[PDB]
Structures are given as structure tokens and as C-alpha cells.
Amino acid sequence: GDTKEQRILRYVQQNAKPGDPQSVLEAIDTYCTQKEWAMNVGDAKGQIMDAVIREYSPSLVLELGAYCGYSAVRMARLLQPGARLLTMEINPDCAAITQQMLNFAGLQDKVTILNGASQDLIPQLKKKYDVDTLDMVFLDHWKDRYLPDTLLLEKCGLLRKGTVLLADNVIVPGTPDFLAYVRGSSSFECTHYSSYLEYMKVVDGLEKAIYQGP
Ligand SMILES: O=C(NCC/C=C/Cn1ccc2cnccc21)c1cc(-c2ccc(F)cc2)cc(O)c1O
Ligand SMILES: [Cl-]
Ligand SMILES: [Cl-]
Ligand SMILES: [Mg+2]
Numbered sequence: 224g225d226t227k228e229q230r231i232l233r234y235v236q237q238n239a240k241p242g243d244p245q246s247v248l249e250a251i252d253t254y255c256t257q258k259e260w261a262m263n264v265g266d267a268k269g270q271i272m273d274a275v276i277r278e279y280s281p282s283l284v285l286e287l288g289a290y291c292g293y294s295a296v297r298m299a300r301l302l303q304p305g306a307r308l309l310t311m312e313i314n315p316d317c318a319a320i321t322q323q324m325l326n327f328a329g330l331q332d333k334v335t336i337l338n339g340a341s342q343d344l345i346p347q348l349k350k351k352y353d354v355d356t357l358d359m360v361f362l363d364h365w366k367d368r369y370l371p372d373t374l375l376l377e378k379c380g381l382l383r384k385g386t387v388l389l390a391d392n393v394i395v396p397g398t399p400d401f402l403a404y405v406r407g408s409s410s411f412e413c414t415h416y417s418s419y420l421e422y423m424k425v426v427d428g429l430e431k432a433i434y435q436g437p
Contacts, residue, residue, distance in 0.1 A: 265421025
């Protein structure tokens with residue numbers, strides 16, 4: 224039958240207001256609290272994301288890992304007119320859910336959903352997607368890819384002085400190599416925001432790592 228992700232989308236469509244991103248977030252969080260847990264960033268960590276997005280007002284954001292579009296909705300709703308989000312999603316079913324979620328939220332003009340693997344798509348961003356440098360990157364994909372993709376972004380010339388990396392799940396499931404690397408590197412200024420795993424009384428956190436140049 225249908226998947227959990229399809230059930231979340233249907234729930235939003237039937238319990239939120241079209242064109243109202245905040246109602247979409249609330250519907251997803253209610254469903255995942257009351258019905259079925261899912262790996263959306265959630266409201267606890269989402270409030271920290273909101274505070275970071277507001278501080279930096281990024282013009283161009285890259286997200287690695289869309290899932291059902293919760294974080295894309297959360298970020299895109301706070302972007303200024305004309306600012307853009309690119310989100311990379313390897314799972315085609317999830318890419319389709321994410322697109323439909325964004326469409327329902329009315330945020331489709333702000334967001335472009337790329338369906339492929341980060342190691343394949345990151346080297347295409349400049350020539351194929353006309354990116355110069357990124358203002359912010361949200362890491363929320365395979366936890367063992369946070370470090371290699373950070374290094375690939377740098378190799379590809381996509382980071383500038385001040386680019387903000389914000390990483391989900393640095394505690395659970397955990398990203399130990401990424402944390403050790405950025406915290407030990409003079410090329411990053413790092414801050415840890417302690418919080419909770421989505422929908423659970425389990426400690427998690429976000430790491431902010433601001434790129435400082437070579
Ligand atoms: O695995 C998670 N996320 C990643 C999903 C797919 C990546 C695959 N993926 C998506 C684009 C892309 C692009 N390129 C390569 C792979 C890619 C995740 C997992 C948990 C979690 C926590 C506790 C627990 F008991 C079980 C699971 C919490 C979370 O908040 C997550 O975010
Ligand atoms: Cl999410
Ligand atoms: Cl939560
Ligand atoms: Mg996550």
C-alpha cells in the first residue's frame with residue numbers, strides 16, 4: 224500500500240491551508256507526534272534553523288537531503304523575495320513528495336528540487352545550475368557524507384568567506400568525523416546548538432560551521 228511519506232503528504236493536503244507554509248509545518252509536526260515518527264528536522268531544531276536563517280538572510284541556499292520537504296518549507300518561507308533554495312534528493316519518491324509539499328505550501332517558485340546523489344550533482348552546480356558561491360548549506364543527508372561533501376564543495380569553489388554550513392543530526396545518528404574536522408580546522412568557525420531529536424526526548428544538535436577561506 225502507501226508509504227509513510229505519502230501518508231504525511233496526504234495529511235498535510237487535508238489538514239493544512241494551501242499557500243500557508245506555517246500550517247504545513249504544523250500539520251507535519253502533528254502527524255509525526257501523534258501518528259508516525261519521521262525523520263523531518265522537527266520543530267525543536269527547526270526553531271534554531273529559523274533563528275540562523277533570519278540572522279544571515281541568505282540569497283542562495285543548498286540543502287543536502289530533502290526527505291518530505293519539511294526543512295525546505297521551513298527555510299524557503301523565511302527567504303527574501305528573489306532568494307533561492309536548491310535541494311538535492313537521491314530518492315525519487317521523496318523528490319516527488321517534496322515537490323508536492325512545496326507546491327502545496329506555495330513555495331515552488333523559490334525552490335528547485337534536484338533528484339540525484341550529492342557526489343554527482345555538486346560538481347555540476349556551477350556550469351549546469353549557474354551557481355557562483357553558496358551563502359548557506361544545510362546538511363541533512365547521509366551522515367557519513369557530511370565530511371566528504373564539505374570537502375567537495377570546497378574543491379569545486381562553491382564556498383566563500385562567510386558561507387554558513389548548518390548540519391543536522393551531529394549527535395544522533397551522529398557525524399563524528401565531520402565534527403572533529405570542522406572543529407579542528409582553522410578554515411571553520413564552529414558553534415554547537417544543543418537540542419532534541421525530532422519528536423523525541425533524545426538529545427541531538429545542530430552544528431554551525433562558518434567557512435573562513437583557505
Ligand atoms: O538518515 C537520516 N537522514 C538522511 C536520509 C537520506 C539520505 C540520502 N540522501 C538524501 C539526499 C542525498 C543526496 N546524495 C546522497 C544521499 C542522499 C536521518 C536519520 C535520523 C534518525 C535518527 C534516529 C534514529 F533512530 C533513526 C534515524 C534522523 C534524521 O534527522 C535524519 O536526517
Ligand atoms: Cl526535513
Ligand atoms: Cl520536535
Ligand atoms: Mg535530519
